[PDB]
Amino acid sequence: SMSYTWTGALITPCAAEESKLPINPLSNSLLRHHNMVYATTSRSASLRQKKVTFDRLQVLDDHYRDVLKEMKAKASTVKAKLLSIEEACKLTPPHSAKSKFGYGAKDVRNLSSRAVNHIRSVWEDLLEDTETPIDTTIMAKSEVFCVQPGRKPARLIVFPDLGVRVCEKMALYDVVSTLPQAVMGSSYGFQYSPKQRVEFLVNTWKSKKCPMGFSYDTRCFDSTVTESDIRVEESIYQCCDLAPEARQAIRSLTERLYIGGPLTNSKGQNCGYRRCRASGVLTTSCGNTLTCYLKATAACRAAKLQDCTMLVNGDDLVVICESAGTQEDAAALRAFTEAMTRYSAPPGDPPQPEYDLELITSCSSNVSVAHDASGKRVYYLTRDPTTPLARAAWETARHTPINSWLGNIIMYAPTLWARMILMTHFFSILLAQEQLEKALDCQIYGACYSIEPLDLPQIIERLHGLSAFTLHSYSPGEINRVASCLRKLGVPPLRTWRHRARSVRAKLLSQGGRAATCGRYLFNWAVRTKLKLTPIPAASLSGWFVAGYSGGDIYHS
Ligand SMILES: CC(=O)N1c2cccc(O)c2NC2=C(C(=O)CC(C)(C)C2)[C@@H]1c1ccc(Cl)cc1Cl
Ligand SMILES: [Mg+2]
């Protein structure tokens, strides 16, 4: 069976779509080579359609059967709980797609009579109708990138109506936030903050007698997900104690929505049909994470890998284990890939055995080493800064509803590029405009958070600890990568950023209060006569690294 069938209707935009980066004074002082930055659009959608459309062989074996049964068994341990409409509503981010049926995201969060009446009716419908496919929209995605020495086609979101998305939360938020950890325990990626993730990868690695590690990338995880997979994923949810309306809701949502369904474009036209995973549902992150864990664990047994530890974030997989020598590790990996391929999880690039942890790239990121204030070697998470920087330049020239620079500052607070460039740049900009006290939207692990940047000292301390304000003496690889990247992009050199930082730092300090605190902590690296950094009393919220809600419709004020 095919991943998608197409009518011929085009994937259509609905606002103006912009591909080229603007030539803006502020972003130009962050990034010069402005032609290199682009945003994907609806014009390349038909390219992605050909990539994402293919037939899917799947052969299941006894290993796959057995992991499944271990998984279900851990799931029957869990008890889930219905959200009230009010709770489900207050989870909806204010810039969600409006409904076909009048009301929009504001009307949901404000509980207007129209929206709630439609939601109630959609809920009633989900309990009463078992079979009618639920319609979805298919839109291209605008995401910015830096060019290749070619250019990526847009990715495609597939999401059901707002009224439906609220109902998903009512019947599944508590499941999707709770069951993945119950099943995979320490393997569940999204329970970890960056610090925590490094702790885990370092521990695991150093506990191995002779460690080998690899990450595995599968072609199009969403299109490779067959309806069988989506059923298995249901059968796991159904091991929970669930109120009877939720059980019935999960049953209808699976049949009607998740297993596949009709696709409409922006203009209302019949577009095609879906038989794999929808990228824009509340169960996409959790479902993927589960399908993935399951297939990888079976393949590990098939491939006879020894002492496998693995960490899973949706479709992103990393595995550390006992080396048996280069030949047989290569051969084991070949077996693992072939086992995975039978499970309808074929690999993009063939996975590569790796004998040093710093060389393992996983969720775009790797561990690196630096030194804290004491001089102790300290491991932290980093990535290549090219894409983060492009999006920073783009979010500078254009107002956008998610600020990836703010997610990158918070996630990569202890990186060289985050500290010298990112912070320096945006505090300068915000300070210019007096918008410092003002709140901004960004996202961690798919869920959307509102954040005042002035609270960055306190947030960083709680996630990373004061160490992040004093890491120094970075590795040469990291410095080289960062530096080669700044030249590629025409981003001014770190030298320049230090000079700028000194000026931001001085100006914040004059402001006093919370701003002066940003100045002392964030920029203590810019001065030689350094300030002593004790904890911030104020820095003493909960669900920040619980689960991953990518594609869900999730918000936190
Ligand atoms: C989809 C998703 O939420 N993640 C993800 C997963 C895999 C690759 C990847 O690049 C990302 N990216 C990001 C993520 C952010 O939190 C925001 C931000 C800005 C750090 C980017 C996030 C992520 C980043 C680093 C790691 Cl180690 C894991 C994850 Cl899930
Ligand atoms: Mg992939």
Coordinates of C-alpha atoms and ligand atoms in Angstrom, one line a residue:
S1 CA 0.0 0.0 0.0
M2 CA 1.1 3.5 -0.9
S3 CA 2.0 6.2 1.6
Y4 CA -0.1 8.8 -0.3
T5 CA -2.4 8.9 -3.3
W6 CA -2.9 12.3 -5.1
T7 CA -5.8 13.7 -7.1
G8 CA -3.7 16.3 -9.0
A9 CA -4.9 19.3 -6.9
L10 CA -2.0 21.6 -5.9
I11 CA -0.7 22.2 -2.4
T12 CA -1.8 25.8 -2.1
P13 CA -0.6 28.7 0.2
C14 CA -3.0 31.3 1.7
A15 CA -0.9 34.4 2.7
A16 CA 1.9 35.8 0.7
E17 CA 5.0 33.5 1.1
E18 CA 8.5 34.9 1.1
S19 CA 11.6 33.0 0.1
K20 CA 14.4 35.5 0.1
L21 CA 15.8 37.1 3.4
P22 CA 15.3 40.9 3.6
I23 CA 18.1 43.3 3.5
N24 CA 17.5 44.8 7.0
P25 CA 20.0 47.0 9.0
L26 CA 19.6 44.9 12.2
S27 CA 19.9 41.4 10.6
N28 CA 22.6 42.7 8.3
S29 CA 24.8 43.3 11.4
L30 CA 24.2 39.7 12.4
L31 CA 24.6 38.1 9.0
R32 CA 25.9 39.4 5.7
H33 CA 25.6 36.6 3.1
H34 CA 21.8 37.2 2.9
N35 CA 21.3 35.4 -0.4
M36 CA 22.4 32.2 1.3
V37 CA 19.3 32.3 3.6
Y38 CA 15.9 31.2 2.2
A39 CA 12.5 30.1 3.5
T40 CA 10.9 27.0 1.9
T41 CA 7.5 27.6 0.3
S42 CA 4.4 26.0 -1.5
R43 CA 6.3 26.2 -4.9
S44 CA 8.5 23.2 -3.9
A45 CA 5.6 21.2 -2.4
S46 CA 5.3 18.9 -5.5
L47 CA 9.0 18.0 -5.0
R48 CA 8.4 16.8 -1.5
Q49 CA 5.2 15.0 -2.6
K50 CA 7.3 12.7 -4.9
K51 CA 9.8 12.1 -2.1
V52 CA 7.2 11.3 0.6
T53 CA 5.1 9.1 -1.6
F54 CA 6.1 5.4 -1.9
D55 CA 5.0 1.7 -1.3
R56 CA 5.8 0.1 2.1
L57 CA 6.8 -3.5 2.6
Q58 CA 6.6 -4.7 6.2
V59 CA 7.5 -8.2 7.5
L60 CA 7.1 -8.8 11.3
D61 CA 9.0 -11.4 13.2
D62 CA 9.0 -13.0 16.7
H63 CA 11.4 -10.3 18.1
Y64 CA 9.0 -7.6 17.1
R65 CA 6.1 -9.5 18.6
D66 CA 8.0 -10.0 21.9
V67 CA 9.1 -6.4 22.4
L68 CA 5.5 -5.3 21.8
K69 CA 4.3 -7.6 24.6
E70 CA 6.9 -6.3 27.0
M71 CA 5.7 -2.7 26.0
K72 CA 1.9 -3.4 26.5
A73 CA 2.7 -5.0 29.8
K74 CA 4.4 -1.8 31.1
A75 CA 1.4 0.3 29.7
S76 CA -1.3 -1.6 31.7
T77 CA 0.5 -0.1 34.7
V78 CA -0.7 3.5 33.8
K79 CA -4.0 5.2 34.5
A80 CA -4.8 8.2 32.2
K81 CA -7.3 11.1 32.8
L82 CA -9.7 13.2 30.9
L83 CA -9.1 16.9 30.6
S84 CA -12.1 19.2 30.9
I85 CA -12.9 21.4 27.9
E86 CA -11.6 24.4 29.8
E87 CA -8.2 22.6 30.3
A88 CA -7.9 21.3 26.8
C89 CA -8.8 24.8 25.6
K90 CA -6.3 26.6 27.7
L91 CA -3.7 24.3 26.2
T92 CA -4.4 25.7 22.7
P93 CA -1.8 28.2 21.4
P94 CA -3.2 31.6 20.3
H95 CA -1.7 31.3 16.8
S96 CA -3.3 28.0 15.9
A97 CA -5.1 27.6 12.6
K98 CA -8.7 28.8 12.8
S99 CA -11.5 26.4 12.3
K100 CA -13.5 25.9 9.0
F101 CA -16.6 26.5 11.2
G102 CA -16.3 30.2 12.1
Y103 CA -14.4 30.5 15.4
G104 CA -10.6 30.6 15.9
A105 CA -7.8 30.0 18.4
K106 CA -8.6 33.2 20.4
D107 CA -12.2 32.1 20.7
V108 CA -11.1 28.8 22.0
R109 CA -8.8 30.1 24.8
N110 CA -11.5 32.7 25.7
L111 CA -14.2 29.9 25.7
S112 CA -16.6 31.8 23.4
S113 CA -20.0 30.1 23.2
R114 CA -19.5 29.3 19.5
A115 CA -16.2 27.3 19.8
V116 CA -17.3 25.3 22.9
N117 CA -20.6 24.4 21.2
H118 CA -18.7 23.2 18.2
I119 CA -16.2 21.3 20.3
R120 CA -19.0 19.6 22.3
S121 CA -20.6 18.6 19.1
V122 CA -17.3 17.2 17.7
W123 CA -16.8 15.3 21.0
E124 CA -20.3 13.9 20.9
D125 CA -19.6 12.9 17.3
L126 CA -16.4 11.1 18.3
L127 CA -18.3 8.9 20.8
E128 CA -21.1 8.1 18.3
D129 CA -19.4 7.6 15.0
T130 CA -16.8 4.9 14.4
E131 CA -16.1 5.0 10.7
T132 CA -16.4 8.4 8.9
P133 CA -13.0 9.5 7.9
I134 CA -12.0 12.8 9.4
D135 CA -10.8 15.4 6.9
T136 CA -7.3 17.0 7.1
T137 CA -5.6 20.0 5.6
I138 CA -2.3 19.7 3.8
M139 CA -0.1 22.8 3.7
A140 CA 3.6 23.4 2.8
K141 CA 5.8 24.5 5.7
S142 CA 7.9 27.7 5.6
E143 CA 11.1 27.0 7.5
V144 CA 14.4 28.9 6.9
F145 CA 17.7 27.4 5.9
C146 CA 21.1 28.2 4.6
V147 CA 21.9 26.9 1.1
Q148 CA 24.0 23.8 0.2
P149 CA 27.2 23.9 -1.9
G150 CA 21.1 22.9 -3.9
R151 CA 18.0 23.8 -1.8
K152 CA 15.5 21.8 0.3
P153 CA 11.8 21.5 -0.8
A154 CA 9.2 22.5 1.9
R155 CA 8.1 19.9 4.4
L156 CA 4.3 19.3 4.7
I157 CA 2.1 19.6 7.7
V158 CA -1.2 17.5 7.7
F159 CA -3.6 18.6 10.5
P160 CA -7.3 18.1 11.3
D161 CA -9.7 21.0 12.3
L162 CA -9.2 23.1 15.4
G163 CA -12.4 21.6 17.0
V164 CA -10.9 18.1 16.5
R165 CA -7.5 19.1 17.9
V166 CA -9.0 20.4 21.1
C167 CA -10.9 17.0 21.5
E168 CA -7.5 15.2 21.0
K169 CA -6.2 17.0 24.0
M170 CA -9.3 16.1 26.1
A171 CA -8.8 12.4 25.5
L172 CA -5.1 12.1 25.0
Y173 CA -2.9 14.9 26.7
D174 CA -2.6 12.9 29.9
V175 CA -1.8 9.7 28.0
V176 CA 0.7 11.2 25.6
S177 CA 2.5 13.1 28.4
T178 CA 2.7 10.0 30.6
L179 CA 2.8 6.6 28.7
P180 CA 6.0 7.0 26.8
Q181 CA 8.0 7.3 30.0
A182 CA 6.2 4.5 31.6
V183 CA 7.0 2.2 28.7
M184 CA 10.6 3.1 27.7
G185 CA 11.8 4.3 31.1
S186 CA 15.2 6.0 30.8
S187 CA 15.1 5.6 26.9
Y188 CA 12.5 8.2 26.5
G189 CA 14.4 11.2 25.1
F190 CA 12.0 14.0 26.0
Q191 CA 12.2 13.5 29.8
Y192 CA 15.6 15.0 29.7
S193 CA 16.8 18.6 29.7
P194 CA 20.1 19.2 27.7
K195 CA 22.3 18.9 30.8
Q196 CA 20.4 15.7 31.8
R197 CA 20.8 14.2 28.3
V198 CA 24.6 14.7 28.4
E199 CA 24.8 13.2 31.8
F200 CA 22.9 10.1 30.4
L201 CA 25.0 9.8 27.2
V202 CA 28.3 10.3 29.1
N203 CA 27.4 7.8 31.8
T204 CA 26.1 5.2 29.4
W205 CA 29.2 5.6 27.3
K206 CA 31.7 5.4 30.1
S207 CA 29.9 2.5 31.7
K208 CA 30.5 0.4 28.5
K209 CA 33.5 -1.9 28.7
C210 CA 34.4 -1.0 25.2
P211 CA 31.8 1.5 23.7
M212 CA 30.6 1.8 20.2
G213 CA 27.7 4.1 19.3
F214 CA 25.6 5.1 16.3
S215 CA 22.6 7.2 15.4
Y216 CA 20.0 5.8 12.9
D217 CA 18.2 8.0 10.5
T218 CA 15.1 6.5 8.6
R219 CA 14.0 7.8 5.2
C220 CA 10.6 9.5 6.0
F221 CA 9.6 8.3 9.3
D222 CA 6.0 9.6 8.8
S223 CA 5.5 8.0 5.4
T224 CA 7.1 4.7 6.5
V225 CA 4.6 4.4 9.3
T226 CA 2.1 1.8 8.1
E227 CA -1.5 1.5 9.4
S228 CA -0.5 -1.7 11.1
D229 CA 2.0 0.4 13.2
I230 CA -0.7 2.9 14.0
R231 CA -2.9 0.1 15.2
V232 CA -0.2 -1.4 17.4
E233 CA 0.3 2.0 18.9
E234 CA -3.4 2.2 19.6
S235 CA -3.3 -1.3 21.3
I236 CA -0.7 0.1 23.7
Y237 CA -2.9 3.2 24.6
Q238 CA -5.7 0.8 25.2
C239 CA -3.8 -1.0 28.0
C240 CA -4.4 2.1 30.2
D241 CA -7.3 2.6 32.6
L242 CA -9.2 5.3 30.6
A243 CA -12.6 6.7 31.2
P244 CA -15.0 5.2 28.8
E245 CA -15.5 8.4 26.7
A246 CA -11.7 8.5 26.2
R247 CA -11.4 4.9 25.3
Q248 CA -14.1 5.3 22.7
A249 CA -12.5 8.6 21.6
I250 CA -9.1 7.0 21.1
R251 CA -10.9 4.2 19.2
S252 CA -12.6 6.7 16.8
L253 CA -9.6 9.0 16.4
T254 CA -7.5 6.0 15.4
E255 CA -10.0 4.7 12.8
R256 CA -11.2 8.0 11.6
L257 CA -8.0 10.1 11.7
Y258 CA -4.7 8.4 12.6
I259 CA -4.9 5.3 10.4
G260 CA -5.2 7.5 7.3
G261 CA -7.6 9.8 5.6
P262 CA -8.7 12.3 3.0
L263 CA -6.5 15.4 2.3
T264 CA -7.8 18.8 1.4
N265 CA -5.7 21.7 0.3
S266 CA -5.9 25.4 1.4
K267 CA -8.5 26.2 -1.3
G268 CA -11.0 23.4 -0.3
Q269 CA -10.1 20.9 -3.1
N270 CA -9.8 17.2 -2.7
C271 CA -6.1 16.7 -2.7
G272 CA -5.3 13.0 -2.2
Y273 CA -5.4 10.4 0.5
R274 CA -3.2 9.5 3.4
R275 CA -2.2 6.0 4.7
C276 CA 0.7 6.8 7.0
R277 CA 1.3 9.1 10.0
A278 CA -0.2 12.6 10.1
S279 CA 2.5 15.2 11.0
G280 CA 0.1 17.5 12.8
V281 CA -1.7 15.5 15.5
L282 CA -1.2 15.2 19.3
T283 CA -0.1 11.6 19.0
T284 CA 2.5 12.1 16.3
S285 CA 5.6 12.7 18.6
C286 CA 4.5 10.0 21.1
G287 CA 3.4 7.5 18.4
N288 CA 6.6 8.0 16.5
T289 CA 8.8 7.7 19.6
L290 CA 6.9 4.4 20.4
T291 CA 6.9 2.9 16.9
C292 CA 10.6 3.7 16.7
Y293 CA 11.7 2.3 20.1
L294 CA 9.8 -0.9 19.2
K295 CA 11.3 -1.4 15.8
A296 CA 14.9 -0.5 17.0
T297 CA 14.6 -2.8 20.1
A298 CA 13.5 -5.7 17.8
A299 CA 16.3 -5.0 15.3
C300 CA 18.8 -4.9 18.2
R301 CA 17.8 -8.4 19.1
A302 CA 17.7 -9.5 15.5
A303 CA 21.2 -8.1 15.0
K304 CA 22.5 -9.6 18.3
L305 CA 23.9 -6.3 19.6
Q306 CA 25.4 -6.6 23.1
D307 CA 24.3 -4.3 26.1
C308 CA 22.4 -1.8 24.0
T309 CA 21.5 1.4 25.6
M310 CA 19.3 3.6 23.4
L311 CA 17.7 7.0 23.6
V312 CA 14.7 7.9 21.4
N313 CA 13.2 11.2 20.4
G314 CA 10.3 10.6 17.9
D315 CA 12.2 9.4 14.8
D316 CA 15.6 10.4 16.2
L317 CA 17.5 7.3 17.5
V318 CA 20.9 6.8 19.2
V319 CA 22.3 3.5 20.5
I320 CA 25.4 2.9 22.5
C321 CA 26.8 -0.7 23.2
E322 CA 29.6 -3.1 23.5
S323 CA 32.1 -3.1 20.5
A324 CA 33.2 -6.5 19.2
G325 CA 35.8 -5.1 16.7
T326 CA 35.5 -2.9 13.6
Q327 CA 34.5 -5.7 11.1
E328 CA 31.8 -7.3 13.3
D329 CA 30.5 -3.9 14.4
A330 CA 30.1 -2.9 10.8
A331 CA 28.5 -6.3 10.1
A332 CA 26.2 -6.0 13.1
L333 CA 25.1 -2.6 11.9
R334 CA 24.4 -4.0 8.4
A335 CA 22.2 -6.6 10.1
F336 CA 20.4 -4.0 12.2
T337 CA 19.7 -1.9 9.2
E338 CA 18.3 -4.9 7.3
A339 CA 16.2 -5.8 10.3
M340 CA 14.9 -2.3 10.5
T341 CA 14.1 -2.3 6.8
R342 CA 11.9 -5.3 7.1
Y343 CA 9.9 -3.4 9.8
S344 CA 9.3 -0.5 7.4
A345 CA 11.9 1.8 8.9
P346 CA 14.5 1.9 6.0
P347 CA 17.6 4.1 6.5
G348 CA 18.3 7.5 4.8
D349 CA 22.1 7.6 5.1
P350 CA 23.5 4.2 6.2
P351 CA 24.2 4.4 10.0
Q352 CA 27.9 4.7 10.9
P353 CA 29.8 3.0 13.8
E354 CA 31.5 5.6 16.0
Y355 CA 34.1 5.1 18.6
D356 CA 34.1 8.5 20.2
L357 CA 31.0 10.1 21.7
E358 CA 31.8 13.6 20.5
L359 CA 31.5 12.3 17.0
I360 CA 28.0 11.0 17.4
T361 CA 25.4 13.4 16.1
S362 CA 21.9 12.9 17.3
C363 CA 18.9 15.2 17.4
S364 CA 21.2 17.6 15.4
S365 CA 23.5 17.8 18.4
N366 CA 26.7 16.4 20.0
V367 CA 28.4 16.4 23.3
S368 CA 31.6 18.6 23.6
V369 CA 34.0 19.5 26.3
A370 CA 34.9 22.8 27.9
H371 CA 36.1 23.9 31.4
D372 CA 34.1 25.5 34.2
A373 CA 35.4 28.1 36.6
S374 CA 37.2 25.6 38.8
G375 CA 38.9 24.2 35.7
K376 CA 37.1 20.9 35.7
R377 CA 36.4 19.4 32.3
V378 CA 32.6 19.8 31.7
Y379 CA 30.6 18.2 29.0
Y380 CA 27.7 20.1 27.4
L381 CA 25.4 19.8 24.3
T382 CA 26.1 21.7 21.1
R383 CA 25.3 21.7 17.4
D384 CA 26.4 23.3 14.1
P385 CA 25.2 26.8 14.4
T386 CA 24.4 27.4 10.7
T387 CA 20.7 26.8 10.8
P388 CA 20.2 28.5 14.2
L389 CA 22.0 31.6 12.9
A390 CA 20.0 31.8 9.7
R391 CA 16.7 31.7 11.7
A392 CA 18.0 34.3 14.0
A393 CA 18.7 36.6 11.1
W394 CA 15.3 35.8 9.7
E395 CA 13.5 36.4 13.0
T396 CA 15.4 39.7 13.2
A397 CA 14.2 41.1 9.9
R398 CA 10.7 39.7 10.2
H399 CA 8.2 39.3 13.0
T400 CA 7.4 35.6 13.3
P401 CA 5.2 33.7 15.8
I402 CA 8.0 31.4 17.1
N403 CA 11.4 32.7 18.1
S404 CA 13.8 29.9 17.5
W405 CA 16.7 32.0 18.7
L406 CA 15.0 32.0 22.2
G407 CA 14.7 28.2 22.1
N408 CA 18.3 28.0 21.0
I409 CA 19.5 30.3 23.7
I410 CA 17.7 28.3 26.3
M411 CA 18.7 24.9 25.0
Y412 CA 22.2 25.8 24.0
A413 CA 22.9 28.4 26.7
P414 CA 26.4 27.0 27.4
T415 CA 27.6 26.9 23.8
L416 CA 30.1 29.4 22.4
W417 CA 27.8 30.5 19.6
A418 CA 24.8 30.9 21.9
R419 CA 26.7 33.1 24.4
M420 CA 28.8 35.3 22.2
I421 CA 26.5 35.8 19.3
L422 CA 22.9 34.9 20.1
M423 CA 22.6 36.7 23.5
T424 CA 24.8 39.6 22.4
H425 CA 22.7 40.1 19.3
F426 CA 19.2 40.0 20.7
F427 CA 19.8 41.9 24.0
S428 CA 21.3 44.6 21.9
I429 CA 18.2 44.6 19.6
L430 CA 15.7 44.4 22.4
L431 CA 17.6 47.0 24.5
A432 CA 17.5 49.3 21.4
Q433 CA 13.7 49.1 21.2
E434 CA 12.8 48.9 24.9
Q435 CA 11.0 45.6 24.4
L436 CA 13.1 43.9 27.0
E437 CA 10.4 43.5 29.7
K438 CA 8.1 42.1 26.9
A439 CA 7.2 38.4 26.5
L440 CA 8.0 36.3 23.4
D441 CA 6.9 32.9 22.1
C442 CA 9.3 30.0 21.5
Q443 CA 9.2 26.2 21.8
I444 CA 11.0 23.4 23.6
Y445 CA 10.4 19.8 22.5
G446 CA 7.4 20.8 20.3
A447 CA 5.4 22.6 23.0
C448 CA 5.0 26.3 22.9
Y449 CA 6.2 28.5 25.8
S450 CA 5.9 32.3 26.4
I451 CA 9.0 33.8 28.0
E452 CA 10.3 37.3 29.1
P453 CA 13.9 37.4 28.0
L454 CA 14.8 39.2 31.3
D455 CA 14.0 35.9 33.0
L456 CA 16.9 34.2 31.0
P457 CA 19.4 34.3 33.8
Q458 CA 17.0 32.5 36.1
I459 CA 15.9 30.0 33.5
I460 CA 19.4 29.1 32.4
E461 CA 20.5 28.6 36.1
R462 CA 17.7 26.0 36.7
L463 CA 18.3 24.1 33.5
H464 CA 22.1 24.3 33.2
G465 CA 23.4 25.7 36.5
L466 CA 25.9 28.6 37.0
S467 CA 28.4 26.5 35.2
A468 CA 26.8 27.8 31.9
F469 CA 27.8 31.4 32.8
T470 CA 31.5 30.4 33.2
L471 CA 32.3 27.6 30.7
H472 CA 35.5 28.5 29.0
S473 CA 38.4 27.0 27.1
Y474 CA 36.2 25.3 24.5
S475 CA 37.6 22.5 22.2
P476 CA 39.4 23.4 18.9
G477 CA 36.8 21.4 16.9
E478 CA 34.0 23.4 18.3
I479 CA 35.8 26.7 17.8
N480 CA 36.8 25.7 14.3
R481 CA 33.3 24.6 13.4
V482 CA 31.8 27.8 14.8
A483 CA 34.5 29.9 13.0
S484 CA 34.1 28.1 9.6
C485 CA 30.4 28.6 10.0
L486 CA 30.7 32.4 10.6
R487 CA 32.7 32.8 7.4
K488 CA 30.4 30.7 5.3
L489 CA 27.5 32.9 6.5
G490 CA 29.3 36.3 6.6
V491 CA 28.6 36.5 10.3
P492 CA 31.1 39.0 11.9
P493 CA 33.9 37.2 13.9
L494 CA 33.8 36.5 17.6
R495 CA 36.3 39.2 18.3
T496 CA 33.6 41.7 17.1
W497 CA 31.0 40.0 19.3
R498 CA 33.1 40.4 22.4
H499 CA 33.4 44.1 21.7
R500 CA 29.6 44.3 21.3
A501 CA 28.9 42.2 24.4
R502 CA 31.0 44.6 26.5
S503 CA 28.7 47.4 25.4
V504 CA 25.4 45.5 25.8
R505 CA 26.8 44.4 29.2
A506 CA 27.5 48.0 30.3
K507 CA 24.2 49.3 29.1
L508 CA 22.1 46.5 30.9
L509 CA 24.0 47.2 34.1
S510 CA 23.0 50.9 34.1
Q511 CA 19.3 49.8 34.0
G512 CA 19.4 48.1 37.4
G513 CA 17.1 45.4 38.6
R514 CA 16.4 42.4 36.4
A515 CA 18.2 43.9 33.4
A516 CA 21.4 44.5 35.4
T517 CA 21.1 40.8 36.4
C518 CA 21.1 39.8 32.7
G519 CA 24.2 42.0 32.3
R520 CA 26.2 40.4 35.2
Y521 CA 25.5 36.7 34.4
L522 CA 25.1 36.4 30.7
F523 CA 28.1 38.6 29.9
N524 CA 30.7 37.8 32.6
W525 CA 32.6 36.2 29.8
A526 CA 33.1 39.5 28.0
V527 CA 35.2 41.1 30.8
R528 CA 38.6 40.1 32.4
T529 CA 37.8 41.7 35.7
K530 CA 35.1 39.1 36.2
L531 CA 32.2 39.3 38.7
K532 CA 31.6 36.6 41.3
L533 CA 28.5 34.6 40.4
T534 CA 26.4 33.3 43.2
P535 CA 22.9 31.8 42.8
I536 CA 19.8 33.8 41.9
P537 CA 17.3 33.5 44.8
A538 CA 14.4 34.4 42.4
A539 CA 15.2 31.3 40.3
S540 CA 13.2 28.9 42.6
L541 CA 8.2 25.8 36.4
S542 CA 7.3 22.1 36.4
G543 CA 6.5 20.4 33.1
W544 CA 9.3 21.6 30.9
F545 CA 11.0 18.3 30.0
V546 CA 8.2 15.8 30.5
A547 CA 7.2 14.8 26.9
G548 CA 7.5 15.9 23.3
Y549 CA 4.5 17.5 21.7
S550 CA 5.8 18.1 18.1
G551 CA 2.9 18.6 15.7
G552 CA 0.4 18.7 18.6
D553 CA -1.3 22.0 19.3
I554 CA 0.3 22.7 22.7
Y555 CA 0.8 26.0 24.7
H556 CA 2.1 27.1 28.2
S557 CA 1.6 30.6 29.5
Ligands
LIG1 C1 11.5 18.9 17.3 C2 12.2 19.2 18.6 O1 11.5 19.8 19.4 N1 13.6 19.0 18.8 C3 14.5 18.5 17.8 C4 14.6 17.2 17.5 C5 15.5 16.7 16.6 C6 16.3 17.5 15.9 C7 16.2 18.9 16.2 O2 17.0 19.8 15.5 C8 15.4 19.4 17.1 N2 15.4 20.8 17.3 C9 15.1 21.7 18.3 C10 14.4 21.3 19.4 C11 14.0 22.3 20.4 O3 13.7 22.0 21.5 C12 14.0 23.8 19.9 C13 15.3 24.1 19.2 C14 15.3 25.5 18.7 C15 16.5 23.8 20.1 C16 15.4 23.1 18.0 C17 14.2 19.8 19.9 C18 15.5 19.1 20.4 C19 16.7 19.7 20.4 C20 17.8 19.1 20.8 C21 17.7 17.8 21.3 CL1 19.1 16.9 21.9 C22 16.5 17.1 21.3 C23 15.4 17.8 20.8 CL2 13.8 17.1 20.8
MG2 MG 14.7 10.6 9.1

